[PDB]
C-alpha cells in the first residue's frame, strides 16, 4: 500500500525480513571541503 | 593474440610472434613437401623467392594460386615494419587502423575511426634522410619540415638537392619520444639527455602543443586558449560610438 | 667541420657512424651561441633560498 | 534545464569557444562597472527568487548571455585596438 497515497501498488510485491549489515564505511569519516588556508612551506600547495 | 595486448602491439608497431610470412614479391605459389619439411615458393618469371615454414604452420595459400606484393602466405599476425617497406606507408596506416578496430569491435566497443587515425598519422610523423641538401645525411626529420626544404629548394631558391627520404613507421612511444619541443621531451624516461642536448644547440620551444604549456603553467593553446578565438573583443553599443569620437583627435 | 666533411666521403664505413656523429655536436655548437668550454663552470650558481626552504 | 538559450548562442558564433570568450569578456566588463553597463535594461534584466521579492540576478555571465542573445553587442575579432579599449572604458562611472 503506498504510504504517500493510500492507493495500492498495482500488482503484488515480494516483502519479508532480510538480515542486513552496516559496513565499515560511513559518510561521517568521508566528506571534506576546503576553500583556503594551510599552505605547506615546502611545496607551497595547500596540504593539511 | 587479442584484447589490449593487441592494441599495444599495434599502437607500438611491434614485430609479433607468428609474423606469419608475407611474400616480398608478386608471383605464383608452389607448396612443397609434407610432414618432413614444409616450404613455400612464390616464384614469378625471373626471381624465385622461398619461404620456409614451421611445418606446424597453417598456411593459407594452396598450390598454384597467384600472389600479391606483401600478401600473407601463412595466417597469423603481420609485421607492420615488413609491410611498410614491401607495400608503402598508406597500406600501413590502413592496416593499423583496421586491426586496432578489429579488437574494440570484436569485443563490444564502438568508436569512430578518426580517433585511431589521428594517432596513427603521428606514428608516421618522421622520415630518415638518404642523400641530403643541407644537414647530415642520416638524420630523422618530421615529414612536413622536410617539405620545408624539398619544395623550398625546388621553387624560389631552386637547385642543390631535393633531399631524398624514407618512410619511417614509428611506434606510438618512439614517435612521442622524438618530439622537437624539449619541454615536452623532458617529461619522458630520461630528462637529462633532452636538456643536455637542447642546451648545446640554442634550442627553442615555441610551445605549440599542450603538454608544453601545462608544464609552464601557461594557458593551454586550445579551446579558449586557441589563438583563433582568444583575441576576440566585445564592444558594447554606446562604448563603440564614444570610442569613435576620440579616434579623430 | 672541415676534417669531418672530408671524413664523410672516404672512410672504410666502419667507424664512419662516429665520424658523422661528431658533427651534430660540432655544428650544433657552431650555429648556437654556445661557446663550448662553458660546459666547464668556473662559477657555480646557487638556487634561491625560498625554492629550497 | 540546460543553459537558457544556448542553442541560439552557439549559432551566433563560428567556433563555440568564441562564444565562451565573449560571455567571459563581457561578464568581465559587466562586473568592473557595477551593472551600469547593461544593454538589455528595461524589463529584460534577469532576476532572483527569495525570502523576499525579485532582486537583480547578480550573475555576470548569466547577464552576459542574456545580453548577447539580443544582437545588441558586437564581436570585433580585431576591431578597436587594445590600447584604446582600456581607454574610454574607465569613463562612465568606473571607480
What Å distances lie between residue D87 and B81, B84, B232, C36, D39, CA to CA?
62, 61, 18, 50, 20
* DSSP per-residue string spanning B204-222: -----SHHHHHHHT---SS
Set of chain B residues whose Cβ sits within 8 Å of the Cβ of D25: 232-234
Cβ-defined contact of B201 to C32 (cutoff 8 Å): yes
What Å distances lie between residue A30 and A24, A26, B80, D15, CA to CA?
12, 7, 50, 41
Classified as helix, coil or strand, D75 is strand
Mutate to test the interface with B, among D9, D10, D18, D83 (most CBs of B within 10 A): D18
Given a contact cutoff of 8 angstroms between Cβ atoms, the answer to whether B194 and B203 are in contact is no
Q: Which of the listed CATH numbers 1.10.150.390, 1.20.1530.20, 1.20.140.10, 1.10.760.10 matches domain B179-242?
A: 1.10.150.390
Breaks (C-N over 2.5 A) in chain A follow: none
Question: Quick one: how far is CA D7 from the chain centroid?
Answer: 17
Cβ-defined contact of B229 to D18 (cutoff 8 Å): yes
Given a contact cutoff of 8 angstroms between Cβ atoms, the answer to whether C28 and B198 are in contact is no
Asked if B192 is an interface residue toward chain C (Cβ–Cβ < 8 A), one would say no
Our CA angle for B12, B14, B20, nearest 5°, is: 145
Distance from the first to the final alpha carbon of chain D: 37
Rounded-to-integer distance, Cα D31 and Cα D61, Å: 9
Classified as helix, coil or strand, B202 is coil
Task: Kindly state the helix (H) or strand (E) to which residue B42 belongs, with its residue range.
Answer: strand B39-43
Rounded-to-integer distance, Cα D95 and Cα A4, Å: 57
Cell of C47: 638556487
The upper half-sphere exposure of residue A36, i.e. CA atoms within 13 Å in the direction of its Cβ, equals 0
* Distance to chain D for B134, nearest Cα, Å: 40
Cell of C23: 658533427
DSSP at B128: E
Cβ-defined contact of D77 to B232 (cutoff 8 Å): yes
CB atoms near residue B211 (< 10 Å): 16
Cell of D75: 564581436
Rounded-to-integer distance, Cα B175 and Cα D73, Å: 46
The upper half-sphere exposure of residue B80, i.e. CA atoms within 13 Å in the direction of its Cβ, equals 28
Given a contact cutoff of 8 angstroms between Cβ atoms, the answer to whether C21 and C9 are in contact is no
Cell of B243: 570610442
CATH of domain B17-78: 2.40.50.100
- Which among C20, C32, C33 is the nearest to B136, CB-wise? C20
Residue boundaries of the structural domains of chain B: 1-16+79-178, 17-78, 179-242
Rounded-to-integer distance, Cα B57 and Cα B38, Å: 9
Rounded-to-integer distance, Cα B158 and Cα A47, Å: 62
Distance from the first to the final alpha carbon of chain C: 47
Classified as helix, coil or strand, B67 is strand
Cβ-defined contact of D29 to B228 (cutoff 8 Å): no
Given a contact cutoff of 8 angstroms between Cβ atoms, the answer to whether B217 and B223 are in contact is no
Given a contact cutoff of 8 angstroms between Cβ atoms, the answer to whether D16 and D8 are in contact is no
Mutate to test the interface with B, among C13, C28, C39 (most CBs of B within 10 A): C28
Q: What are phi and psi of A46, to 5 degrees?
A: -60, 130
* Distance to chain B for C20, nearest Cα, Å: 7
Cβ-defined contact of B199 to C23 (cutoff 8 Å): no
Cβ-defined contact of C32 to B202 (cutoff 8 Å): yes
Cell numbers 603521428: residue: B122
Expt. technique:
X-ray
Rounded-to-integer distance, Cα B64 and Cα B29, Å: 5
User: Structure resolution in Å?
Assistant: 3.2
Domains and their CATH numbers in chain D:
1-95 (3.90.940.10)
- Counting as contact any 3 or more CB pairs under 8 A, the partners of D are B
Rounded-to-integer distance, Cα B54 and Cα B45, Å: 27
Task: Identify which of B84, B76, B27, B80 has the alpha carbon closest to the alpha carbon of residue B40.
Answer: B27
- Please count the residues of chain C: 53
Task: Kindly state the helix (H) or strand (E) to which residue B31 belongs, with its residue range.
Answer: strand B27-32
Cell of C21: 656523429
B206 backbone φψ class: left, alpha, beta (φ>0; ψ -120 to 50)? left
- Which among C17, C20, C28 is the nearest to B200, CB-wise? C28
Set of chain B residues whose Cβ sits within 8 Å of the Cβ of C17: 138
- Which among B138, B199, B201 is the nearest to C20, CB-wise? B138
Task: Identify which of D56, B225, D22 has the alpha carbon closest to the alpha carbon of residue D9.
Answer: D22
Rounded-to-integer distance, Cα B130 and Cα B168, Å: 12
Set of chain D residues whose Cβ sits within 8 Å of the Cβ of B224: 17, 20-21, 24
CB atoms near residue C27 (< 10 Å): 15
Cell numbers 611498410: residue: B84
CATH of domain B1-16+79-178: 1.10.1790.20
Rounded-to-integer distance, Cα C37 and Cα B92, Å: 47
Given a contact cutoff of 8 angstroms between Cβ atoms, the answer to whether C44 and C32 are in contact is no
Question: Quick one: how far is CA D90 from the chain centroid?
Answer: 17
H helical segments located in chain B = 3-11, 80-87, 90-107, 113-122, 143-150, 172-177, 182-186, 191-200, 210-216, 238-244
Sign of the CA dihedral running B139, B142, B145, B150 = positive
Amino acid at each position: 500500500y503506498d504510504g504517500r497515497t493510500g492507493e495500492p501498488f498495482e500488482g503484488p510485491i515480494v516483502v519479508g525480513q532480510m538480515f542486513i549489515m552496516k559496513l565499515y564505511h560511513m559518510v561521517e569519516d568521508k566528506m571534506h571541503a576546503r576553500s583556503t588556508g594551510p599552505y605547506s612551506l615546502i611545496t607551497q600547495q595547500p596540504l593539511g | 593474440t587479442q584484447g589490449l595486448p593487441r592494441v599495444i602491439e599495434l599502437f607500438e608497431a611491434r614485430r609479433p610472434k607468428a609474423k606469419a610470412v608475407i611474400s616480398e614479391i608478386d608471383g605464383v605459389v608452389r607448396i612443397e613437401e609434407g610432414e618432413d619439411r614444409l616450404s613455400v615458393f612464390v616464384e614469378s618469371e625471373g626471381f624465385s623467392k622461398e619461404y620456409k615454414l614451421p611445418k606446424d604452420a597453417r598456411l593459407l595459400v594452396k598450390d598454384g594460386d597467384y600472389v600479391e606484393a606483401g600478401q600473407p602466405l601463412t595466417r597469423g599476425a603481420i609485421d607492420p615494419h615488413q609491410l611498410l617497406e614491401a607495400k608503402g606507408p598508406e597500406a600501413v596506416e590502413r592496416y593499423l587502423v583496421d586491426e586496432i578496430q578489429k579488437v574494440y569491435r570484436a569485443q563490444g566497443v564502438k568508436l569512430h575511426d578518426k580517433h585511431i587515425e589521428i594517432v596513427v598519422r603521428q606514428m608516421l610523423k618522421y622520415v630518415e634522410v638518404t642523400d641530403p641538401g643541407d644537414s647530415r645525411l642520416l638524420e630523422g626529420q618530421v615529414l612536413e619540415k622536410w617539405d620545408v626544404e624539398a619544395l623550398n629548394e625546388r621553387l624560389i631558391a631552386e637547385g642543390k638537392v631535393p633531399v631524398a627520404w624514407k618512410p619511417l613507421l614509428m611506434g606510438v612511444t618512439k614517435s612521442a619520444l622524438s618530439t622537437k619541443s624539449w619541454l615536452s621531451a623532458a617529461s619522458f624516461q630520461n630528462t637529462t639527455h633532452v636538456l643536455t642536448e637542447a642546451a648545446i644547440a640554442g634550442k627553442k620551444d615555441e610551445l605549440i602543443g599542450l603538454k608544453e604549456n601545462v608544464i609552464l603553467g601557461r594557458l593551454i593553446p586550445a579551446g579558449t586558449g586557441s589563438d583563433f578565438v582568444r583575441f576576440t573583443q566585445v564592444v558594447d553599443q554606446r562604448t563603440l560610438k564614444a570610442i569613435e569620437e576620440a579616434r579623430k583627435e | 667541420e672541415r676534417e669531418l666533411l672530408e671524413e664523410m666521403k672516404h672512410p672504410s664505413r666502419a667507424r664512419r657512424a662516429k665520424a658523422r656523429k661528431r658533427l651534430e655536436v660540432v655544428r650544433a655548437f657552431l650555429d648556437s651561441g654556445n661557446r663550448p668550454e662553458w660546459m666547464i663552470l668556473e662559477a657555480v650558481p646557487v638556487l634561491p633560498p625560498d625554492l629550497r626552504p | 534545464m540546460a543553459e537558457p538559450g544556448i542553442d541560439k548562442l552557439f549559432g551566433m558564433v563560428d567556433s563555440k569557444y568564441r562564444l565562451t570568450v565573449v560571455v567571459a569578456k563581457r561578464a568581465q566588463q559587466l562586473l568592473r562597472h557595477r551593472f551600469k553597463n547593461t544593454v538589455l535594461e528595461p524589463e529584460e534584466r534577469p532576476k532572483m527568487r527569495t525570502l523576499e521579492g525579485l532582486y537583480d540576478d547578480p550573475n555576470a555571465v548569466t547577464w552576459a548571455m542574456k545580453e548577447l542573445l539580443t544582437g545588441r553587442l558586437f564581436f570585433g575579432e580585431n576591431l578597436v585596438p587594445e590600447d584604446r579599449l582600456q581607454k574610454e572604458m574607465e569613463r562612465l562611472y568606473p571607480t
